[PDB]
């Protein structure tokens, strides 16, 4: 028996499915901590890694890139989970080491690679307080390049009324997303700040674990996946939908929640995305 | 002569108890580094630095973390140039802890 | 595997600070004993007796001390079978505080 | 220039002392650290070591017994301090090492040493919370001999309604000795219980120190030698009263203070004991 996130039915993904729209043919780079690609109710397509200590990309000895790996395709099928783009072409791009730790240059190249393999949507649950010049020139390249880049708030929860959102998230062209509960309450720990754009479920949020395992995680991380995810049930429907177009349609049929701050544009809803 | 001895622990929660301890090292800086600390040398360094400041440990800049949340507490009590310390932070993930020092939480 | 770390203070007066810690040591009790304990070994045996509990560790009996008040404040910190401790106890003069572990306090 | 400490007037015996009452004669044992007999304003008649390890009771490596010794019977003359019997022959029974601690079977050998060379008055400032049947049988068997044995109450000050006093200053045929200050209160610190029997100054009591030295210290330490200095002074004056006569007299002619579980039967006013 395969058994449905509560966060992918919250975004509404099934709708698509129904629909037929799965992400079929969309390639989505989870720039992470690995896959493992031996995993029954995954798919991994190909992918790289840039830490140079552990080059394979699809050994995952840190657990996070396959949670987050299935949020956004665990395989419609009748085991385990179910992914928002079911049908994506999932890459492992390897950046953080099995400690979670990445350096920024590897971060970078791994980006680098993403462009340079046409990847469609670029997920990035991962971040750091600094921000870099070759940071936001590699994210920025990527947007020019036609991808779509989301990545996680953080989880530096409130701080007065100075923003919490760290790097990647931060930079105008990255969609940076905070995580909800399934009550719609943003998590406790969710960052806030006039850079946050989107909210998606990340509160206990179901996915694949290494070694044929499913779990529940909590974080920014888990929200990231939903809107990558959904960014590839768009472009599954229109293909030739630039990045600009697939994002402002996430933005702006977004259910309102509180104040932007704390919020930004409230709850993705893909089926409304898609038009 | 430094009275310099400290106690570090980690445990998965957001306070001291209700916060099992799972890891714990003791680091001597005085009269030279010593202690269970697979990198005893640099944290003394590290501290010699912000001079025992917990507080003063910049981050990274230079790393990221997955943005999973699962707490960690760190405590450090004893004393650094004979001044008493009891210290005591919640980080949002334990990669988190690590970017912190450079070597004090190089565990 | 035994989370045991523990930082001993002991400095002159009546309460934690108020009280300057004139001495400090260390002391690990897993896997094996060690530590900076002119006797790791056997405070290590003391606390396993008593299972850790300062507070059951037997004065002396066989020995007595000069009957002057100056008062020493001895602290524990750190955990014990992964258990935390937090201990401090005010002795009349040292020879009363020498006279209570058999060696944990062999400081 | 010599300075009469405020404990030694309170007492009152330097109205003794101007009646030619200095405790000439009077064999008094302290029992203790040693007694520095280099220091200039004491005059050690003789002494032993049962410390093992330090055979030499003229060699005071914690201080504390030099104190005491002068509080009984720093020199007459015109430097440092005044004892209460500055004419008494004193004795360094060595005890206690160098970090002050003593074992049982040391202090009963000291009270075996004292017994047998004819000691008229025993200083015992030391203690512990445990008695002991030959403990106890030496401290009997010195009273039986005709000596007067004096020791401090302990520094457990109160604790509840139960008995703080040690040993030997609990057994009764031991004057167990507390601590008031110059305003006849009891200190903090002093033992309490129905085994007490007299108060001596015992707050900041200034005294000699090894290597020419001069100091304060606190403890039932401190009060404990005014009364064996007091009991010296009544045997110089009446040099063939017993044991039970001088102790009678100290208990008999004491200023009353608070309640006897606290304070004993009061101060001790030796110019009232000796009649
Ligand atoms: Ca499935
Ligand atoms: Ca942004
Ligand atoms: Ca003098
Ligand atoms: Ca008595």
Same mark, same amino acid.
């Given at each position: 028996?395969?058994?449905?996130?509560?966060?992918?039915?919250?975004?509404?993904?099934?709708?698509?499915?129904?629909?037929?729209?799965?992400?079929?043919?969309?390639?989505?780079?989870?720039?992470?901590?690995?896959?493992?690609?031996?995993?029954?109710?995954?798919?991994?397509?190909?992918?790289?890694?840039?830490?140079?200590?552990?080059?394979?990309?699809?050994?995952?000895?840190?657990?996070?890139?396959?949670?987050?790996?299935?949020?956004?395709?665990?395989?419609?099928?009748?085991?385990?989970?179910?992914?928002?783009?079911?049908?994506?072409?999932?890459?492992?791009?390897?950046?953080?080491?099995?400690?979670?730790?990445?350096?920024?240059?590897?971060?970078?190249?791994?980006?680098?690679?993403?462009?340079?393999?046409?990847?469609?949507?670029?997920?990035?649950?991962?971040?750091?307080?600094?921000?870099?010049?070759?940071?936001? $020139?590699?994210?920025?390249?990527?947007? %020019? =390049?036609?991808? +779509?880049?989301? @990545? *996680? !708030?953080?989880?530096?929860?409130?701080?007065?009324?100075?923003?919490?959102?760290?790097?990647?998230?931060?930079?105008?062209?990255?969609?940076?997303?905070?995580?909800?509960?399934?009550?719609?309450?943003?998590?406790?720990?969710?960052?806030?700040?006039?850079?946050?754009?989107?909210?998606?479920?990340?509160?206990?949020?179901?996915?694949?674990?290494?070694?044929?395992?499913?779990? $529940?995680?909590?974080?920014?991380?888990? %929200? =990231?996946?939903? +809107?990558?995810? @959904? *960014? !590839?049930?768009?472009?599954?429907?229109?293909?030739?939908?630039?990045?600009?177009?697939?994002?402002?349609?996430?933005?702006?049929?977004?259910?309102?929640?509180?104040?932007?701050?704390?919020?930004?544009?409230?709850?993705?809803?893909?089926?409304?995305?898609?038009? | 002569?430094?009275?310099?001895?400290?106690?570090?622990?980690?445990?998965?929660?957001?306070?001291?108890?209700?916060?099992?301890?799972?890891?714990?090292?003791?680091?001597?800086?005085?009269?030279?580094?010593?202690?269970?600390?697979?990198?005893?040398?640099?944290?003394?360094?590290?501290?010699?630095?912000?001079?025992?400041?917990?507080?003063?440990?910049?981050?990274?800049?230079?790393?990221?973390?997955?943005?999973?949340?699962?707490?960690?507490?760190?405590?450090?009590?004893?004393?650094?140039?004979?001044?008493?310390?009891?210290?005591?932070?919640?980080?949002?993930?334990?990669?988190?802890?690590?970017?912190?020092?450079?070597?004090?939480?190089?565990?």
């Amino acid at each position: 028996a395969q058994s449905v996130p509560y966060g992918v039915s919250q975004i509404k993904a099934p709708a698509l499915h129904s629909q037929g729209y799965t992400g079929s043919n969309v390639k989505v780079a989870v720039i992470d901590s690995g896959i493992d690609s031996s995993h029954p109710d995954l798919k991994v397509a190909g992918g790289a890694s840039m830490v140079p200590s552990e080059t394979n990309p699809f050994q995952d000895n840190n657990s996070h890139g396959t949670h987050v790996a299935g949020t956004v395709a665990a395989l419609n099928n009748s085991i385990g989970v179910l992914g928002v783009a079911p049908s994506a072409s999932l890459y492992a791009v390897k950046v953080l080491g099995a400690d979670g730790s990445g350096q920024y240059s590897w971060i970078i190249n791994g980006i680098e690679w993403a462009i340079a393999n046409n990847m469609d949507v670029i997920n990035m649950s991962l971040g750091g307080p600094s921000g870099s010049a070759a940071l936001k $020139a590699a994210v920025d390249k990527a947007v %020019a =390049s036609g991808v +779509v880049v989301v @990545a *996680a !708030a953080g989880n530096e929860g409130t701080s007065g009324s100075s923003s919490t959102v760290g790097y990647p998230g931060k930079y105008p062209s990255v969609i940076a997303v905070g995580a909800v509960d399934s009550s719609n309450q943003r998590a406790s720990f969710s960052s806030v700040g006039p850079e946050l754009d989107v909210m998606a479920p990340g509160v206990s949020i179901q996915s694949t674990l290494p070694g044929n395992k499913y779990g $529940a995680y909590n974080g920014t991380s888990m %929200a =990231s996946p939903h +809107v990558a995810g @959904a *960014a !590839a049930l768009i472009l599954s429907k229109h293909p030739n939908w630039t990045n600009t177009q697939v994002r402002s349609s996430l933005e702006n049929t977004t259910t309102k929640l509180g104040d932007s701050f704390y919020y930004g544009k409230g709850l993705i809803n893909v089926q409304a995305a898609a038009q | 002569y430094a009275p310099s001895a400290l106690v570090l622990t980690v445990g998965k929660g957001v306070s001291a108890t209700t916060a099992a301890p799972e890891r714990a090292v003791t680091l001597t800086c005085a009269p030279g580094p010593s202690g269970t600390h697979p990198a005893a040398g640099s944290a003394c360094a590290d501290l010699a630095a912000v001079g025992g400041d917990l507080n003063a440990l910049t981050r990274g800049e230079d790393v990221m973390c997955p943005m999973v949340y699962d707490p960690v507490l760190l405590t450090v009590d004893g004393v650094w140039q004979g001044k008493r310390v009891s210290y005591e932070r919640v980080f949002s993930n334990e990669c988190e802890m690590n970017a912190h020092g450079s070597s004090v939480f190089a565990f």
